[PDB]
Every structure is written in structure tokens, then in C-alpha cells.
Amino acid sequence: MKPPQFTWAQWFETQHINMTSQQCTNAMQVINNYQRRCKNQNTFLLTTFANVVNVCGNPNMTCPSNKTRKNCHHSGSQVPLIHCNLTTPSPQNISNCRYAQTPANMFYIVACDNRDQRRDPPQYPVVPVHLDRII
């Protein structure tokens, strides 16, 4: 579900950090134009990539979405976030998909992995790769 020019960390940043508009309909155009389908729902955390990287330094826990993975990490604090929900599909014309937006303040659990050796910047050896749950 990730376009080939992205590492997992870059796709995480594109889907969950870089909300290019405060309006979900506009912000989701980026994700949808890249992945070639209107995503039914998506969460943008109102935080920085660096903050999430530091959450990767919190204790490892089981990933709620996968009882077999132990590469997840719970945020220390709640953050503001915007959850986008598709209201008007448009599979033949992705730019016309419309979304609702729901603001919330919640903790987050992210899966983190070692960076992509060839393509992720050496600045961050450990990077977030999935938004597993918001709580």
C-alpha cells in the first residue's frame, strides 16, 4: 500500500505527520493521489516527526493490531490529532473524494524499525513505520 519511491518511514510521515491542509478533503488528496485509491479513514497526528522518533525510544510493547509484534511504542502524552473519514467515494476521479474531519486529543502507539539503509537519512537510525493505534 506504499508507493515505491517511499521508505516505510517516509510513507508514515506522508500519511500521519505532514497534514498539508487543516481540511481533511485537501490533506487526503495527497495520500490518495499517491496510493491510487481513496483511503477510507486516516489519522494525522499534530506532532513532529522528531517527536515520534523519540517515542520510538519509549519501552517496547505489543502492537495492538498484531499480537505477534513487539516493535510498538506508546506516546508519553496525548496529542491533538485529526481523523479523516471518507464521506463521498470517487474511485474514477480521486480528486473528488470528500472527507469529514474529527479532532481529538489522544495517545498514540507507533511501530518503529531500523531505518532503510539505502534511502532513509542517517540522522534517524530508528524511525516510525506504522501508526498502530490511537487511544
From Swiss-Prot:
Its EC number is 4.6.1.18. Liver, lung, spleen, leukocytes and body fluids. Substrate binds at K39, N40, Q41, N42, T43. Keywords: Chemotaxis, Disulfide bond, Endonuclease, Glycoprotein, Hydrolase, Lyase, Lysosome, Nitration, Nuclease, Signal. Glycans are attached at W8, N18, N60, N66, N85, N93. GO terms for cellular component: azurophil granule lumen; extracellular exosome; extracellular region; extracellular space. The active site is at H16, H130. The keyword Calcium does not apply. One of its GO terms (biological process) is innate immune response in mucosa. It catalyses: an [RNA] containing cytidine + H2O = an [RNA]-3'-cytidine-3'-phosphate + a 5'-hydroxy-ribonucleotide-3'-[RNA]; an [RNA] containing uridine + H2O = an [RNA]-3'-uridine-3'-phosphate + a 5'-hydroxy-ribonucleotide-3'-[RNA]. GO terms for molecular function: lyase activity; nucleic acid binding; ribonuclease A activity; RNA nuclease activity. It is an enzyme of class 4 (lyase). A particular signal processing and glycosylation pattern may differentiate the UpI2 RNase, found specifically in pregnant women urine, from other nonsecretory RNases. Belongs to the pancreatic ribonuclease family. Interacts with and forms a tight 1:1 complex with RNH1. Dimerization of two such complexes may occur. The N-terminal region is necessary for mediating chemotactic activity. This is Non-secretory ribonuclease. It comes from Homo sapiens. The gene is RNASE2.
